[PDB]
Amino acid sequence: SHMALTEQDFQSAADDLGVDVASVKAVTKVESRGSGFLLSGVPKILFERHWMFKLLKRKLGHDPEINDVCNPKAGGYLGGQAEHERLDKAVKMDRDCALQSASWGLFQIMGFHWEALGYASVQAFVNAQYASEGSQLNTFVRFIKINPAIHKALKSKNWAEFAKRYNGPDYKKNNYDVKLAEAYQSFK
Numbered sequence: 777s778h779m780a781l782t783e784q785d786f787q788s789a790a791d792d793l794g795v796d797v798a799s800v801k802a803v804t805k806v807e808s809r810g811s812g813f814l815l816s817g818v819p820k821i822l823f824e825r826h827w828m829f830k831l832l833k834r835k836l837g838h839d840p841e842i843n844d845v846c847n848p849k850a851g852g853y854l855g856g857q858a859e860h861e862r863l864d865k866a867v868k869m870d871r872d873c874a875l876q877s878a879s880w881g882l883f884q885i886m887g888f889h890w891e892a893l894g895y896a897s898v899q900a901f902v903n904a905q906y907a908s909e910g911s912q913l914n915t916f917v918r919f920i921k922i923n924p925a926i927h928k929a930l931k932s933k934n935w936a937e938f939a940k941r942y943n944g945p946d947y948k949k950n951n952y953d954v955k956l957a958e959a960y961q962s963f964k
Contacts, residue, residue: 779813781882785910789917795931798963803930804882804913805959806952807942812882812905812912814857819905819912821878823862824886826850828877831888832870840869872898880905881912885919893918933960 781804783797790797812820825847832840840846845866854862859878866874875898876888885893890901893915904911920927929938939952947953 779817779908780811781909781913785908785913788910789913792914792917793920793927793930796933796964798960799930799933800913801963802956802960803916803938805962806955807916808882809884812880812909814860816857818857818860819880820882820884821859821863821880822853822855822884823859823866823878824850825852825862825866825877827886827888828866828869828873831873831876835870835873845869845874875899875902881915882909883912883916883919885915889919892922935960 786797786800786804790800793800809820814820823845825845826849828846829840829842829848832846842848843865844852845862846869853859863874863878866877876886876890879886880902887898887901890898893901895901895904901915904915920930923941926938926941929935929941935956936953939947939956943950943952
């Protein structure tokens with residue numbers, strides 16, 4: 777109920793980035809999934825078995841065993857609470873790699889970014905996904921900071937450049953450059 781973002785959270789992030797409050801609301805409206813939590817109260821995730829293969833391959837120094845939650849071929853997605861059963865299975869192979877191989881919260885940030893984002897450990901990154909949407913928004917803010925090119929675009933309010941660098945070269949297919957601008961106006 778209170779787990780959802782508030783003006784207090786939007787402003788903390790805006791101040792932390794050093795940008796307009798409406799700019800943070802804009803990207804949150806488009807780049808987020810509305811809620812960063814499922815019904816049970818656990819974070820919204822999507823498990824990437826090909827990242828589980830890559831990360832566990834780096835750790836061991838050889839190919840791991842290929843199953844339905846560890847495979848160099850991307851896909852096999854279930855969805856919602858079902859994704860947490862895939863994570864639980866992957867945790868029994870290797871906890872750190874599994875947790876790192878899922879995208880977490882509002883902005884679906886991959887858990888292997890934990891170190892670049894400046895968290896004490898993998899477990900610190902996860903606890904921040906369980907805490908609140910405000911913490912999940914802090915994670916997003918941290919991702920924007922470590923991408924100066926994307927951070928500058930947000931401050932200069934380019935949208936076209938921000939959408940290109942964040943969403944990908946094929947951003948105009950979903951009208952991200954436009955949606956961001958129209959969203960920005962809806963709050964401004």
